[PDB]
Symmetry: C3
Subunit: 222 residues, 3 copies
C-alpha cells in the first residue's frame, strides 16, 4: 500500500506465522510435563505476534496521534503484542532456573508496568511527557534486567543454557527503548519505515530467534 512500512509488516507477518507452524510441528510428541511448558511458551509467543503483525499489516492495529502539531501514526498493536509475549518470555527464564513465585510476580508485574507506560507514552499528545513515560518504562526494564542478571545449584546444563538466553535478553530487550527513542514515537531521528523495520527485526529475533535457542537445549526437559 501507501504505507512504505507495509513490506516490513508483511515480512514480519510471514516470519511469525512460519515460526508458529514450525514450533507447532516440532512440539508434536512432547510428553514431558516440564518440556511441555517451554513448548507452550515458545509456540504461543510467535502465535500472538503473528496476529499482531497481521493487524498492523491490515491497518487495524494502528492509530493517529497528534504531537508536534502533526498526526503521528502509532502502531498500538506492537504494545498489545509485547504485553502478552514479554511476560511469557520471562516465565520461560524463571522456570528454567526454578525461580521463586515472589520473584516471578515481581518480574511479570514489573513487565506490565514496562509495556503499560510505553503504551501511554506512545499515545500521549504532550510531546514532552512522552519521554517522561519513556524513562519510567526504561526504569522498569532495568529493574527486570537487574533481576535476571543478579538474582539467580542448578544442573550445569540449566546454568549454561540460562547464561546464554540471559545474555541474549539483555542485548535484545535493551535495543527496544533505543529504537523507540530514535524512531517516530520519540525524537523522530529515524523515519517510520526504518522504525518499523528495526522493531520487526527485533521482534522476530526475540520471538522466533529466542525460542529456537531455547528448544535446542535439553535443559528444558525434566
Amino acid at each position: 500500500t501507501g504505507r512504505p512500512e507495509w513490506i516490513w509488516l508483511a515480512l514480519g507477518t510471514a516470519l511469525m506465522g512460519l515460526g508458529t507452524l514450525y514450533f507447532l510441528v516440532k512440539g508434536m510428541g512432547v510428553s514431558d510435563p516440564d518440556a511441555k511448558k517451554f513448548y507452550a511458551i515458545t509456540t504461543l509467543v510467535p502465535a500472538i505476534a503473528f496476529t499482531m503483525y497481521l493487524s498492523m499489516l491490515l491497518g487495524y492495529g494502528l492509530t493517529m496521534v497528534p504531537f508536534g502539531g502533526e498526526q503521528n501514526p502509532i502502531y498500538w498493536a506492537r504494545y498489545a503484542d509485547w504485553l502478552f509475549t514479554t511476560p511469557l518470555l520471562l516465565l520461560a527464564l524463571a522456570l528454567l532456573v526454578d525461580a521463586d513465585q515472589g520473584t516471578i510476580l515481581a518480574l511479570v508485574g514489573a513487565d506490565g508496568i514496562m509495556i503499560g507506560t510505553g503504551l501511554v507514552g506512545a499515545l500521549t499528545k504532550v510531546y514532552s511527557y512522552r519521554f517522561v513515560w519513556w524513562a519510567i518504562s526504561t526504569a522498569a526494564m532495568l529493574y527486570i534486567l537487574y533481576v535476571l542478571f543478579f538474582g539467580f545449584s542448578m544442573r550445569p546444563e540449566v546454568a549454561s543454557t540460562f547464561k546464554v538466553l540471559r545474555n541474549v535478553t539483555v542485548v535484545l530487550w535493551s535495543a527496544y527503548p533505543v529504537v523507540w527513542l530514535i524512531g517516530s514515537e520519540g525524537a523522530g531521528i529515524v523515519p517510520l519505515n526504518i522504525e518499523t523495520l528495526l522493531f520487526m527485526v527485533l521482534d522476530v529475533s526475540a520471538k522466533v530467534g529466542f525460542g529456537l535457542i531455547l528448544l535446542r537445549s535439553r535443559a528444558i526437559f525434566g
Copy 2:
C-alpha cells in the same frame, strides 16, 4: 426499546442472574478444596455473563461498525464476556483430568487468541478482512477442541464425567463460529435479532447449562 433484540438480552440477563444466585446458594457449605475450585468457576462464569448481558441490555456494551457502507451494531460486550468465561470453562476441564500446566497454558493462550481475533474481526471495517480474522479465530478453536479430544488412569468417575462435558463442549463451542458467520457480523444471512437470540441460547447453555452438568458429578470432589 427500539432494539428488537432487547427481549433476548433481557431474558439472557435474567437467566444468567438467576443462575448466579443458584450456584451461589448451592455453593454454600463446600469445604472440599477441589470441589471449591469447580464451585468457584461454575459460579463466576454466569456472574460475569450477567454483567455483560446487562451491559448489552442497557446499551453500554454496544458499538456501531461501518462495513458494507452501513452502520452495523456490534455487541463487543459478548467478547469481553467470552474473554473471561471461556478460559475458566477450560480450566474446569483441565482440573477435572489433572492436565499438566503446560497444556493448560497452551489452551488459555489459545483461547485468548480465539476471542481476541473474533473481536478484531467484529470491529474490522474492511468487510473482507473480517472473515480473515474469523478463520484465524476458528483455527484457534479447532486447536483447542483438538487438545480436549486427543490429549487426555483417572478414576472412572472423572473419565466418565469428562467424556460428557467434552462432547458438550465440542457441539456448543462449534456452534459459535457458525452463528457469527451467518449473523450480522459476517455475511448477514440472519438478522441481528435472530443473531442475538442464538448467542443467548448458546451462552445460557454454555454458562448455566454446562455448570449444572458439572456440579452434579462427584468427579469434582476429592
Copy 3:
C-alpha cells in the same frame, strides 16, 4: 493547573512514588521464598498506583462523560489502578492464611467484577443506570468482605496479623463506594476536588499504609 484537584493528584503521585522506593529499598536482601511474595506485592502495588496517579496528574488518565446534560470529568485511571492493585492486596491476605485456590479464584474474580462494573457505571451516560452499576459493584464488594470475615489452626502470629489487616480492609474498602456515591461520579454532593482528595487519602492508606502494616509482621516469614 486549572484543575483544582491537581494538587491532590500531585501529592498522591509523590507519596506513591516515595512509597515504592521505600518498599524497594526495604525489600533488598529478602531471601525467604514466602517473605518474597509479600515483598513483591507490597512493592508492586504503590508502583502501579504511582503510574496511575501520574497519568491522572498529566491529564492522560482522564476523560469527559456527559451525564445530567454536562461534561463530567472521569478519572478512569483510578479504575485501571484498582483493577490491578485490589487483587494483589487480596492475594496477600489469602497467602497469609494459606487460603485454598478455589477461594482465591472466587475473590479475584469477584474483585474484577467489582472494579469492572464501577468503571462501567463511571462511564455510563444514562444517569440512572450509573447507580445500577454502583449497586452491583457494591454487592461484589460485600461478597468479598463477607469471605475475608467469615471464611478463614494458623500460627497465632498469622491469626493475629490477619485479624488486623482484615479489620483495616473492611473500613478502607467500604469507604470507596461511599465516596463514589457522594462524589461527582454519583449524586454530586461533593465537588470533584474534594472527591479526588478523599480517594487519594484512601489510596495512600490502602497502598502504602496497608503495606507498612503488613511488612512489620513476622507472620510474612516462613
